[PDB]
Every structure is written in structure tokens, then in C-alpha cells.
Design an enzyme around this catalytic site. Structure first.
Site, PDB file in Angstrom:
ATOM      1  N   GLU A  50      14.598  -5.094  36.086  1.00 41.31           N
ATOM      2  CA  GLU A  50      13.430  -4.298  35.159  1.00 41.31           C
ATOM      3  C   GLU A  50      12.972  -5.161  34.826  1.00 41.31           C
ATOM      4  O   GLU A  50      11.637  -4.959  34.551  1.00 41.31           O
ATOM      5  CB  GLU A  50      14.045  -2.668  35.235  1.00 41.31           C
ATOM      6  N   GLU A  61       8.155  -1.159  35.831  1.00 37.15           N
ATOM      7  CA  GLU A  61       8.985  -1.180  35.685  1.00 37.15           C
ATOM      8  C   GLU A  61       9.449  -1.681  34.404  1.00 37.15           C
ATOM      9  O   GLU A  61      10.100  -1.437  34.143  1.00 37.15           O
ATOM     10  CB  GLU A  61       8.800  -3.278  35.570  1.00 37.15           C
ATOM     11  N   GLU A 100      14.670  -6.568  45.006  1.00 35.78           N
ATOM     12  CA  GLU A 100      15.170  -5.164  45.218  1.00 35.78           C
ATOM     13  C   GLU A 100      16.178  -4.758  46.187  1.00 35.78           C
ATOM     14  O   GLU A 100      16.443  -3.028  46.292  1.00 35.78           O
ATOM     15  CB  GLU A 100      13.497  -4.473  45.664  1.00 35.78           C
ATOM     16  N   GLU A 152      11.206   3.229  45.368  1.00 35.83           N
ATOM     17  CA  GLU A 152      11.432   2.047  45.813  1.00 35.83           C
ATOM     18  C   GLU A 152      11.166   1.884  47.045  1.00 35.83           C
ATOM     19  O   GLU A 152      10.862   1.043  47.652  1.00 35.83           O
ATOM     20  CB  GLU A 152      12.694   1.577  44.602  1.00 35.83           C
ATOM     21  N   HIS A 154      10.829  -7.506  35.871  1.00 38.59           N
ATOM     22  CA  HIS A 154       9.279  -7.370  36.489  1.00 38.59           C
ATOM     23  C   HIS A 154       8.447  -6.922  35.748  1.00 38.59           C
ATOM     24  O   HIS A 154       6.979  -6.755  36.131  1.00 38.59           O
ATOM     25  CB  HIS A 154      10.268  -6.047  37.506  1.00 38.59           C
ATOM     26  N   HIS A 200      18.212  -2.737  43.743  1.00 39.30           N
ATOM     27  CA  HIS A 200      17.525  -1.649  43.154  1.00 39.30           C
ATOM     28  C   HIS A 200      17.656  -0.387  44.406  1.00 39.30           C
ATOM     29  O   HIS A 200      18.705   0.313  43.940  1.00 39.30           O
ATOM     30  CB  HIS A 200      16.293  -1.202  43.263  1.00 39.30           C
TER      31      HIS A 200
HETATM   32 FE   LIG Z   1      11.319  -3.166  39.926  1.00 36.05          FE
END
Ligand SMILES: [Fe+2]
Ligand SMILES: [Ca+2]
Lengths: 72, 168, 386, 510, 388
Positions: free
Chosen positions: D127, D97, D226, D192, D130, D229
Site C-alpha cells: 500500500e 492506497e 493485488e 479491492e 501504491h 491483497h
Molecule cells: Fe493498493
């Protein structure tokens, strides 16, 4: 001096007792055999803003547990 | 005294660097250290476990010395060796664009690092170089990356195959 | 089903029983303090430090690192994932920095969120309260839409100047502060646009398109040198510290503070504009917040480093002189906007005084920290040349 | 004068115009690709709104954690094996992360369109969220769990073991070192979309199964981010689909990224799932096949085919080397248990039956070995035995892949048993597959990672552990353990007595 | 003990097993909607409505009530706990009202909390940014400390005017709105004091004591009629609706709006004061928020009641005329403060225009709703007479 400063609830509460002023009809609208001394003090020095904050913090947790982990 | 973060080897170099009180001596030692101990082309792997740490402690000395020796303009535009940073950059970038293949390209890039990595070259020019040199190095390398078979590739890299094992 | 098919070890009688039976009698270690080995900046370790310090997997060869060995994968050429080579500054420990506001992600977004929701409420109260009525039409359609609007590109540019630092910062604490400094800048830029978009809704004829303010920024004279400085801090600087340091402890501390506070914050009120000042209150809160972090990193940690104090100050003074010039030029050009103001709006004495406030604060909070000898009269006179 | 305001999308409408042109307005990082400077982002967000939608998620998460979950003692009522497993899963994810922060900061610098930059920017912040989130899991388990050690200092104690090295490859260096686009593939297009997203959900599943309600609470919250991402990883492929260089380099960087990622997670995740738990959720072979072949290698890459993207050529290899990979690895992880920051356990009978049932032949190989080690006394500190010795005794050298850092034992493995050893300019290199070997041959300067045998060579085990703080607060008992029971915990002294001294297995080819 | 002694039915294997075994297969009713029987104001029932409507245990003899029978215990004399006798207004259903902002407790405190935390951040940024420097000394020590300060007592008084309604309101929805209207008023009064307290910290010599502003309020001329109106709305009104209605749809809509917006909000900027405007932004947000609720209750529900529309409008027009006078008087006296301003600060034309804005908005948002025939010129001219 430009140091970062603010004012907290108790600093404002210090003068809250002076908020009420005197005048003829400044009296209770309800029947009562008693006479509440008009100099009585309260235990917690709170103001609306601070009261709301300490209660909202409690809500965060409560509803967090409810809508999330407890529901799961 | 044996250790991962603290050992005789490292103490040794600390005293060695403590005796460098001249930008020129220090700068030259750092460059020499890089030729001797860094990159797959290093002259030897004797300091494999400590070179990264030693190199840094060496850079610290060159940096301090360079700051006290150079005027403001030079600290910004000249290398610790007195070379004009932009000239070196543009020059090295020139050769990189004239590179005929990936084998010449990597030689240029890797050598550039060994010679001009800060505090030798100012970081602004260095990272500008990292950007341009790296781009050309990759373009040349990632073209038909899988065409050359491993047997041949090992020959091209010039490795000495010591052992191969394969049930399939 | 009412109960669901999935069984959970915490509530399923069978599974939980097995779990409970495997548990030790008491914890296998009484030290329940994550990050206990971190050197506290304050009396007790804070949640901020525990959750942040050492998250960056640096090896000992990058001052302060706790790991060992080279990176597993580097750039073509050999450039390390993170390395000392990405900045001229040196230190005994890159994890020394501490955001004085102790902002990790959760607290950060919580605050901006509060500000967002209140901004919404404010605007809804502002529009319903018809306050727009008392605002000067020229100031609105000209100085807010064009000049204030064009300033958004200045903030946007400073925002982007942080992109390389987010990638190169040598520690978690510094990386997080940097990320928050730049994120606050894009926020401001979007708030300037939010106001333009708001006005478009309450003022019939106000075009929220960025075309005009953008043309003012790209081709105007007022912000010409300002844009030239921004393009440089952003794209001509590859040293993440020179970038952060020069942006916050030089350019924005002078030019930015003057435009925001000494021009728009100072004059908008005079034209019956309480709107813009609402957003500038945010920008200034953000600025004062970032300043504390910037000061701790460059002065408290770097400029006062036990081993590289001298070295670092030398370098920051170098950077100060390098950028002070383009910043003065940006201010000089900005002086031209005053001639565009309705006569009598403000005089040369007010402007000089305000310039002196910005300059004295700068010498106050920045220049003096690294022993940069700054002449306040010389700086102001150079700017006044407009 | 009706009550009105402005929302994020109303401001975002003009965000693309924020960027202006000028000579040096270009990426500061090397890259073979050209990101179209007109690329658009999927979500019309601004800083204010982003913060609000994330803070709302925090409210719940921390609410459940500080309140109901603490009242229920959710931090303790977790199976011992899983409490240990979470020390690794959460801290290792934390660095993935954390490097994803630098990685997207690099992608943000690469993007030229204001919208594509803003997309990456939102991730730079996600991030960071996270990183702190994964950190909180360890923090919570340290403060409230049955065993704080490891949870409270994984950031430094993880450096002792070999599993950490491979983690930095796929989730640290692989995320930020190389061509911005290559890194983007490691992080978003593969990492990911193929592993992290499906994995995060899987962990909450295994967690719930073992009494852990803490992880689901945090990870399910991470999961909600997510979606953004994915859009960035997908937008990266689009922003370069029109550049002629893409048709020449994309598939090679993608295949390399796929291999890099699976090389580590195929065996590590499976291991953490099946061996770090008591209650099973689903066989890793089944899980892996669905993720990598069906979901990713089929549905995910299929939709990118129109942009010139193709299925990774090393895909078939990955599948064939997968079946036993995680089983092969646990053997090494347990044998080297003293180098960890967590306590490992040997499969109980119920589990051996499970393994054999799902992996025919499991018993005759791994099962029999684990039983021998237990008879030997690998769980008892007074035995003077450590599985590493068994490896030396039976001439089963353990090597470290110079590229992926993944430990492998070709003479014992049931999966891949390939081994390529080379000498180049005074240095020996050991590879475990034809893809990693090619990577090193073509880019030797990118892979110079000293493995643990090299660094620890000649060093006595207890001294390496002591030096790197592998002890509990009592300054004597090891953090790592060969069992998850409450008593008979090994001490530094129990290890010193073994007089185990590391050796670089490659020095034998001499 | 790591596990604790207390066993919990949700996690204790034994107890949970017993619990699970007693559970039905599916819920005993598919209607999982609490408050399902409540008539929705919008498309779908809101959490706000579900959690609020019918919380007040009213019997059917109080319009809208769902219970039956007298109260269990009443006042000496026989006064009902709640009853129709506490207000002149009549309706078909007291639970008809809906706060347009749908504010129940949680949302209410969440917003004020955000505002509180941001205020803190703002002041800390304001003090560190040294903005106080550019503020006019006379405006600071005189108009903010004395006159703005004195205004806090106006807000405090309006706050207290809600005390009887909090007790007498005939429904939950109305009671909650009322409570929030008054609570926002005490908040404002405290914010005015917060600023005075803040200035005391950054301005060496600024006394935060309320003595001066209080003496201005109790014995001054500027706020004399204002205080007289406040004392009346607060203590001479026993009808909780006349109180709420007159306070918000009359006095504060005129006097309050003029002082806050047309004086301090309008002039503070001119003296380099961006501080006061920060707090007035809050007060005006609060005002516009309360206005929506006040409008829904008195105009949407009462003034437009299917059965008592005529009656209610008659009564509110009566109240408007009753309080419009004292309010005009409060404004008239307020006009005196302009003479205290440095010459050239503002002229008679600006003041008249601003008065007209307040009056037109009032006719706009209030007077017209109940067909109160208001002459804007007459009202303004009556006030302007106060200009010295
Ligand atoms: Fe992440
Ligand atoms: Ca006039």
C-alpha cells in the site's frame, strides 16, 4: 566522533597510479614502435565498484523500457 | 473576517484559551466544550464548522498545563481532574458490560468520550477503553441490524421526520 | 495477430491525430513541480517529499492538516479515523518530520533487495569456501542456535510493537518511517532464522526448528526480563509515539545494542564465527538508519517544537524513566549468559567497559536530547548485579 | 562443501512460531470477531524477498518512464480530457492506497497468528508502494504534461470540491474507521476484489485508448501486487468463519461494506470513464454488470459461501439505482465545475451519439440540458453563466448524502429520486437511500461529516476558491475549467462577477 | 515547442500509417529465437548463451569457428588476429565453455553495483556505530595498514596477468569469463585500499598513503617470493591459458587462499576487527565465483576434451609443477609474518592445520582434476620451513 562516513571511488583512485611497481620484465608483451610514458594519467577517476554502478543504472532504464513500455 | 481555516470565530477562541492558566479551569472548559459542541448529543450546532479545530487548540492548553502540574506517576495514571484513570476505565467498562441494550451502550460510550478524551485521561487508558467499549457497542448494535423497519427505527432514534419522498 | 486488435492513442494514426489536434500550444501552467507548495527541508524539494508529504488527508484540526471538516465515517462511539487523542505528544505540524535518508518505497526495497541478493551470494561463497570448519562447535550449537536464536523473538516483538503506529501515525512522513523501522525489525528476526536454517544445511545435526530458541525465550532466565519488557512495549502501550520512542530511544538503544554489538558481535569472532557477524552488520546498519529518523522525529521535530518543546521533553523524559527500569532489568538478566561461556572467554572488566559504551552512546544520542539526567555509573552497577 | 543458501520459504516455514503467548497478547482495536490464531497466509514471504520482487518491478516501471516514455513524449501526447481525468483518478486512488496502509496496519494488529500478521504486513508495505506510485503518476504528468495544475497540488486543491468527500468515505474512513473486520470488508473483500482490481485494469485500458501510456506503465505494475491483497481479504473471512459471532455479524458488515463502496464508485467511476475520455472502451453499464454481478456478486462471494457468506441484500437495489447514476452525477459535477481541481468538457456530438446509442433516452434528458448550457455560454467566461445557476432557476436543489457524501438532485435525477430529510437535536440530515439512512439512524455518531453547503454557506464562490488555492501559478486563472481548450480560461474574477453565494439547501425545510 | 520538431515513425500519424501499410500480415519466419543454432549447455538456451556464443568472428581453422578464410588484416610478420599459436592447449571447440553463473555484462555489473552500494551503507553504519573502538591498535596500524595493504599489490598483479588473455582468448565465452576474473581482482585490490582510506577517516593518524604497504611489497621479506611469483605469472607468461590456469588453479588457490582466509580472515576477528572480514567476504565470494568458471574451462572443457583430454591434462600438470614451486616459496616467505604477531596470537599447530586446509582444498578442487600427484605432507613441510 561517530559521524556517518564512507569512501568514494575518486578517494581510492588518488592512489591508483602507485599500484604499479617496477621490475625488470614489467613491459608490454606486444610489438610497438612507440613508448607510452609510464606517468600518463586518465580522465575519469573510477574504480571497479563505481564503474559497475554507473553502468547498471543505465541498464535498469534500457531494459526497463524494452521489457515493459516498448513491448506493450 | 470570514474564512474556512481562519475566521473571527476561531480567533475569538484563541484569546479565550490564552486566558486559561490553571489546569482546573482549562480542563473544566474543555469538558464543557465537549458537552456543548461535540457528538450527535452536543447542546448546539452553532460551532459545527469550527469546533473540531477549537477543541484541539483547547486540548493543547490542558495538556501543557497538566504536564507542568502533574508529577510523573500522575501524568501517567491520573486524569486531569485528579481521578484515577484505571478506576474510571474499569468502572465505565463495568457499566458497558451491564448495558441492557444498544441504546444504553451508545450513551455510555459517547459520554465516555465527551468526558475523558485526552488530555483529560491518559491516552493509554483511553484507547484501552476505546477498544473494550467499542467492542460491546458493536456487538449490541450489529445484532439483527435489519429487523427493525425504518418507520419504527426513526421513532426509536427519536428523529423528527421533516420530509419523505419515494417513487418506489 | 502481429499487431493486436487493441488500438492505442499514442500510436494509432487516426486516434493520435485526433489527440494531437486537441492539444494546446503550450502547457496551461508553467509550474510543472508536483508538491511545489510543500516546505522543503533541504535546498530543493526532493522526490521523497513530493511523493509523500500531505498524502494523509488530515484536516486542519490535526496540526499541519490542509483539509477541513470531520471524517466521513468514524468508529462506533465516535472515535475519529485519525485524531490528536491517540498520542500524548503535541506539535505545531505533524508533517514536519523528514527521514534523513529520504526513503520512500522504491529506494527502501531497492536497498533491502541488494542486501538480500548479496546475502545469497555471501552464503553460497561461505559454504563453498568451507569457512564453517573453523567455527567452535559449542558456540555454534549453543550460543547461536539457542541464545542468538532466542533473540529473534525479541526483534519479532519489537516488530509487532509498530502495528498500532502504522495505523495511528498522524502523518505520511511519520507513518512511512515507522513502517520502515518495524519492517527492518521483522527482517532481522528472519535473518537470525535464515542463519539457523543455513547452518542446518552445512552442519549435519543442527536442527533449524525454532523450538529450542523459542523455549529459551518463553521460559529461560537469560531473556526473561527482556521478554517481559517486549510484551509490555508491544501490548501494554496504546500511544503510538510512546511505543516508537520507547522502543528505539530506550529499550533497543540499550538492551538491543548491548546484545547485538557488545555480546554476539564482540564474541562470535573469538569463536571462529564470521557468519553471525555478517547478519549483525545488517542489523546495525538498519539500527543506525532508523536512529536518524527517530532522532529527527522526536528530537528535531517534537523535542524542539517551537510551541511544545517543553511539554514534549517532559513527556519523553517521563517515558524514558518509565522504560529505563524494565530495560535495565532486561540487561541485568542478560548478564547471566556470561556465566554460560567457556571460562576465560571474557572478564568482568570487558563486560563493564562494553556496558559503559552502550550507556554512553545512549546518553550521547538520546538521553541528552531531552535533558534526561542519567547517571551512567548507577545504571551499569544496577546491571552488573548479574 | 557445495554452494548453498536459504530461501524465503525455508525461513517462512518457522514464521508461524514467531508469536508466543502471554496475558495481554491481544488486539488493541475493538472488534466483534475472533481471528483464529492459527490462520495461515498464502505467500511464504520474508522482508528481504518481498523487497526484491518489488524492486524488480520498479526497475522496469521507472525505466520505461524516465527513458522510452519520456523520449516519446508520452506525458504530452494524451487527450486533454484524459490528462484532467488522471488528476482525479490518480490522486483519489492515492488516498485509497494511503489509508489502506493504516487499514492493514490495523488488521496486522488484529491478527493473532504470526502468518496472518505477516500477510497484512506485506500489504502495509504494498500500500505504501501504491501511494507513492499513484503519487508518481501525478508527479510525472505535472512535470511532463500539458497541464500541471491539479496534478501538482491535488493534495490540497481536492479539498475544495464535493467529489473528494465521498472518496474519503469509501477509500479513507471506510478503510480504517470501525470494526477491523468491517474495515477489512470495505478494503479487501469488497473494495479491492469488486472494484479496485478490475478498475485498475480498466483505467489502463481507457488510458491507452486516450494516448496515455504512463498510467498503464504504473498501474499495471500496481496490479501485480493485488494478488496478495485478495488473499488477505479472503483470509480474513476464514480466520473468523469458526467464531459464533461471525454467523451473527459477517453478512451485515459485508452488506454495509458493499453498499458503502458501490454507492460511490457506481456513479463516480462510470463518470470518470465515459465523460473524462474522448475514445471509449466499453459502456459502463456493461462493465458494472460484469464486475458487480458476474465476477464479484457471483463468482467471488460464491466461493465464500461455505464460510457463511451470502450475497449482499442491497444488491438488487444497487443494480436498479445504477443505470443512470453516473449520468446524474456528471450533471452536478459539471454544474459545480468551479469547485474542482481539473478541467471538464461537455460531450461533443460524436460522444452524444455514443451515449444515446448505449443509453436510450440519454439525449432527451442530459443531451438537451448540456446543449442548453452551451448555448447559455457555460464554456465562455464572458457569459456570466455557471450551470449551478440553472439548477437554482429551475428549483432543482442539490443535496449531499449525510453518509456517503455523494451529491444528488432528486428532482432532476433519472436514477434514484428518493429523499429522506430528518431533524435530530437541532440538526438537519439528508439521505438518498434506505441503506445509508439506516446506517445513520443506527450509528448517528459515526456520520457527522459537514457537507460543502454547510461549510461554504453564505460564502461567495470566488472567495472559497481563492482561500483554498484553486488558482494556477499566475494567481488569477482558475485551475478548474468548463472546457478543455487552450484559451478563454476562466479567472477568479470571472467567478467573482457571477456573485454566486452558497446556500444550505436543507434550510428550506424550515 | 511542447511537441518538438522531430517526428517519430512510431507516433507520427502520417509516417506510422505508411509504416503499417508496408507490414506483412504475420512474421516472415516463426523462429523468433536468436542464437537458436547454438548448442545449449542446459535444458533451454539461456539469454547468457544467446547474447554471447559466436560473437567472436572465428573461422573454422580455430576450433569451433563458424566463419571461413584468413583475417582481413594481420600483424606485421603475419601473426593472425586470433590464432591457435597463442596457447599450448588444444580443443575440439573453443566455444564449449560456459560460465556456470551465466554472467554476461548486465548481470555482472548489477551484482557488483549491489555490493558497492551496500558496502557504502555498511561503512556508514560501521563508523556511526563506533565499532572501530574495540579494534586492537597494533593489528590496525601494523597488520592491516602494512601487511594487508601490501597484499593489494598481489591482487593488482594478478589483475594485470589477465591483460594478454583479454586480448588473446579464442572465444567470446572464455574472453568474458577471463575479463570478469581479472576485473574482480582489481576490485579487491581497490577494496583493500578503500579500507585503508576509510580507516584514515575514522582513525586520527592513520596515513592512507600506499607508500608503506608498497614498500613492504617491493622490498619486504614477507611478500618477497609472493611478488616474485606475481611478476612472473604476469610478465613472463605469454600463453593466455597458462596465465589464467596458473593464476587461479595454482597460485591463488594456494597462496591467495591462505593469506586471505587462513591469516587475515582467521585472525582479524581475534583483534576486534570486523572491518577487514567484511571486505574479505567479498574477495572470497569472488574467488568461489571465478573457481566455477575456471573449473568448467580447464577441467570440464579442456581437461575432459573428447580429443585432447590426455594432451591437455599433460600440459596442465606441466604448468602445475612449474608454478607450484614458486607458490610454495611465496607461502614459505609468508610464514615469516607469524613471528611478527603478538606472542600467543596463534601456534604452530594452528598454522599447520590451516595450511593443510588450503592444500587439501586445492588437491580437492584442482590437482585431482588433471591427475596431478600432489603430496600434501611434503608441500606443507616445505612451507613450514619458513616459520621463524
Ligand atoms: Fe493498493
Ligand atoms: Ca595448541
Amino acid at each position: 566522533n561517530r559521524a556517518p562516513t564512507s569512501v568514494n571511488a575518486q578517494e581510492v583512485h588518488r592512489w591508483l597510479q602507485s599500484f604499479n611497481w617496477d621490475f625488470k620484465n614489467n613491459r608490454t608483451k606486444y610489438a610497438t614502435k612507440y613508448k607510452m610514458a609510464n606517468e600518463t594519467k586518465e580522465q575519469f577517476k573510477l574504480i571497479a565498484k563505481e564503474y559497475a554502478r554507473m553502468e547498471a543504472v543505465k541498464d535498469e532504464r534500457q531494459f526497463g523500457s524494452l521489457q515493459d513500455a516498448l513491448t506493450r | 473576517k470570514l474564512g474556512i481555516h481562519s475566521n473571527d470565530t476561531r480567533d475569538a477562541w484563541v484569546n479565550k484559551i490564552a486566558q486559561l492558566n490553571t489546569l482546573e479551569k482549562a480542563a473544566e472548559m474543555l469538558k464543557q466544550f465537549r458537552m456543548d459542541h461535540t457528538t450527535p448529543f452536543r447542546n448546539s450546532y452553532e460551532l459545527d464548522n469550527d469546533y473540531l479545530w477549537i477543541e484541539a487548540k483547547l486540548e493543547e492548553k490542558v495538556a501543557v498545563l497538566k504536564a507542568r502540574a502533574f508529577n510523573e506517576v500522575d501524568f501517567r495514571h491520573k486524569t486531569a481532574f485528579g481521578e484515577d484513570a484505571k478506576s474510571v476505565l474499569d468502572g465505565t467498562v463495568a457499566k458497558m458490560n451491564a448495558a441492557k441494550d444498544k441504546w444504553e451502550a451508545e450513551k455510555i460510550h459517547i459520554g465516555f468520550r465527551q468526558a475523558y478524551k485526552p488530555p483529560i485521561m491518559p491516552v493509554n487508558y483511553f484507547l484501552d477503553g476505546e477498544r473494550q467499549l467499542g467492542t460491546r457497542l458493536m456487538e449490541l448494535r450489529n445484532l439483527n441490524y435489519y429487523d427493525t423497519p425504518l418507520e419504527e427505527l426513526r421513532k426509536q432514534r427519536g428523529v423528527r421526520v421533516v420530509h419523505l419522498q419515494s417513487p418506489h | 495477430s502481429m499487431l493486436g486488435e487493441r488500438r492505442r492513442g499514442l500510436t494509432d494514426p487516426e486516434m493520435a491525430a485526433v489527440i494531437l489536434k486537441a492539444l494546446p500550444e503550450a502547457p496551461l501552467d508553467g509550474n510543472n513541480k508536483m508538491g511545489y507548495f510543500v516546505t522543503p527541508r533541504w535546498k530543493r524539494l526532493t522526490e521523497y517529499e513530493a511523493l509523500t508529504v500531505y498524502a494523509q488527508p488530515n484536516a486542519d484540526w490535526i496540526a499541519g492538516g490542509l483539509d477541513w471538516g470531520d471524517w466521513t465515517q468514524k468508529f462506533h462511539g465516535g472515535r475519529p479515523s485519525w485524531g490528536n487523542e491517540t498520542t500524548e505528544l503535541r506539535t505545531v505540524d505533524w508533517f514536519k518530520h523528514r527521514d534523513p535518508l529520504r526513503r520512500w518505497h522504491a529506494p527502501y526495497v531497492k536497498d533491502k533487495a541488494e542486501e538480500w541478493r548479496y546475502t545469497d551470494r555471501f552464503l553460497q561463497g561461505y559454504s563453498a569456501d568451507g569457512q564453517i570448519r573453523a567455527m567452535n562447535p559449542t558456540w555454534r550449537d549453543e550460543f547461536i542456535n539457542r541464545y542468538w536464536g532466542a533473540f529473534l523473538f525479541n526483534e519479532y516483538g519489537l516488530f509487532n510493537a509498530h502495528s498500532q503506529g502504522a495505523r495511528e501515525a498522524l502523518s505520511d512522513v511519520t507513518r512511512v518511517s515507522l513502517a520502515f523501522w518495524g519492517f527492518d525489525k521483522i527482517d532481522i528476526a528472519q535473518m537470525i532464522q535464515l542463519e539457523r536454517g543455513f547452518l542446518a544445511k552445512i552442519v549435519p545435526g543442527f536442527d533449524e526448528s525454532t523450538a529450542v530458541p523459542k523455549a529459551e525465550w518463553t521460559n529461560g532466565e537469560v531473556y526473561k526480563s527482556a521478554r517481559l519488557a517486549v510484551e509490555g512495549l508491544w501490548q501494554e502501550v496504546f500511544d503510538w509515539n510512546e511505543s516508537a520512542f520507547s522502543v528505539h530511544a530506550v529499550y533497543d538503544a540499550l538492551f538491543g545494542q548491548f546484545v547485538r554489538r557488545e555480546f554476539f558481535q564482540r564474541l562470535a569472532p573469538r569463536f571462529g564465527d564470521n557468519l553471525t557477524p555478517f547478519f549483525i552488520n545488517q542489523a546495525q546498519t538498519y539500527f543506525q538508519i532508523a536512529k536518524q529518523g527517530v532522532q529527527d522525529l522526536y528530537y528535531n521535530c517534537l523535542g524542539d517544537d517551537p510551541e511544545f518543546s517543553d511539554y514534549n521533553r517532559t513527556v519523553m523524559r517521563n517515558w524514558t524513566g518509565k522504560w529505563l527500569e524494565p530495560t535495565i532489568a532486561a540487561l541485568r538478566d542478560f548478564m547471566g549468559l556470561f556465566a554460560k561461556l567457556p571460562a576465560g572467554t571474557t572478564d568482568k572488566e570487558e563486560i563493564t567497559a562494553s556496558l559503559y559504551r552502550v550507556v554512553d552512546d545512549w546518553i550521547e544520542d538520546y538521553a541528552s536530547r531531552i535533558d534526561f539526567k542519567a547517571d551512567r555509573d548507577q545504571i551499569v552497577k544496577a546491571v552488573l548485579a548479574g | 562443501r557445495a554452494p548453498t543458501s536459504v530461501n524465503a520459504q525455508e525461513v517462512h516455514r518457522w514464521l508461524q512460531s514467531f508469536n508466543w503467548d502471554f496475558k495481554n497478547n491481544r488486539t488493541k482495536y475493538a472488534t466483534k470477531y475472533k481471528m483464529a490464531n492459527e490462520t495461515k497466509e498464502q505467500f511464504k514471504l520474508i522482508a528481504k524477498e518481498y523487497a526484491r520482487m518489488e524492486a524488480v518491478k520498479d526497475e522496469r516501471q521507472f525505466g520505461s518512464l524516465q527513458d522510452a516514455l519520456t523520449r516519446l513524449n508520452a506525458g504530452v501526447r494524451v487527450h486533454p480530457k484524459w490528462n484532467e481525468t488522471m488528476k482525479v483518478v490518480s490522486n483519489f486512488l492515492e488516498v485509497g492506497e494511503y489509508n489502506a496502509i493504516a487499514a492493514t496496519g490495523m488488521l496486522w494488529d488484529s491478527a493473532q497468528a504470526a502468518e496472518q500478521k505477516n500477510g497484512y504486513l506485506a500489504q502495509v508495505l504494498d500500500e505504501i508502494r501504491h501511494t507513492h506510485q499513484c503519487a508518481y503518476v501525478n508527479y510525472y504528468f505535472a512535470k511532463n504534461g500539458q497541464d500541471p495544475a491539479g496534478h501538482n497540488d491535488a493534495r490540497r486543491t481536492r479539498t475544495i470540491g464535493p467529489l473528494w468527500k465521498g472518496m474519503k468515505r469509501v477509500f479513507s474512513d471506510g478503510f480504517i474507521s470501525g470494526d477491523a473486520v468491517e474495515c477489512s470488508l470495505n478494503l479487501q473483500l469488497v473494495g479491492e476484489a469488486c472494484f479496485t482490481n478490475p478498475l485498475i485494469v480498466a483505467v489502463t485500458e481507457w488510458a491507452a485508448a486516450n494516448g496515455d501510456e504512463i498510467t498503464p506503465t504504473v498501474f499495471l505494475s500496481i496490479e501485480t501486487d493485488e494478488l496478495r491483497h485478495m488473499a488477505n481479504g479472503y483470509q480474513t473471512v476464514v480466520s473468523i468463519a469458526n467464531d459464533p459471532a461471525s454467523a451473527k455479524y459477517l453478512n451485515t458488515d459485508l452488506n454495509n461494506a458493499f453498499w458503502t463502496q458501490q454507492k460511490y464508485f457506481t456513479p463516480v467511476l462510470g463518470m470518470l470513464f465515459e465523460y473524462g475520455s474522448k475514445f471509449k472502451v466499453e459502456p459502463w453499464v456493461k462493465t458494472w454488470d460484469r464486475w458487480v454481478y458476474e465476477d464479484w456478486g457471483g463468482i467471488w462471494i460464491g466461493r465464500l459461501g461455505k464460510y457463511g457468506v451470502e450475497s449482499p441484500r442491497s444488491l438488487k437495489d444497487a443494480k436498479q439505482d445504477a443505470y443512470w447514476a453516473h449520468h446524474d452525477l456528471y450533471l452536478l459535477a459539471y454544474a459545480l465545475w468551479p469547485t474542482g481541481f481539473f478541467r471538464l468538457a461537455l460531450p461533443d456530438q460524436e460522444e452524444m451519439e455514443w451515449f444515446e446509442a448505449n443509453y436510450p433516452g440519454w439525449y432527451d434528458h442530459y443531451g438537451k440540458i448540456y446543449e442548453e448550457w452551451r448555448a447559455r455560454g457555460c464554456e465562455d467566461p464572458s457569459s456570466g453563466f455557471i450551470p449551478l445557476m440553472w439548477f437554482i432557476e429551475n428549483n432543482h436543489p442539490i443535496y449531499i448524502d449525510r453518509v456517503s457524501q455523494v451529491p444528488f438532485c432528486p428532482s432532476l435525477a433519472k436514477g434514484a429520486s428518493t429523499l429522506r430529510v430528518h431533524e435530530y437535536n437541532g440538526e438537519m440530515h439528508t439521505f438518498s437511500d434506505q441503506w445509508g439512512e439506516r446506517m445513520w439512524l443506527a450509528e448517528p455518531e459515526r456520520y457527522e461529516c459537514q457537507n460543502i453547503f454547510e461549510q461554504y454557506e453564505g460564502r461567495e464562490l470566488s472567495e472559497v476558491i481563492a482561500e483554498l488555492h484553486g488558482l494556477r501559478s499566475d494567481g488569477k486563472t482558475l485551475i478548474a475549467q468548463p472546457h478543455v481548450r487552450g484559451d478563454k480560461l476562466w479567472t477568479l474574477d470571472d467567478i467573482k462577477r457571477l456573485n454566486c453565494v452558497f446556500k444550505n439547501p436543507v434550510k428550506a425545510f424550515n
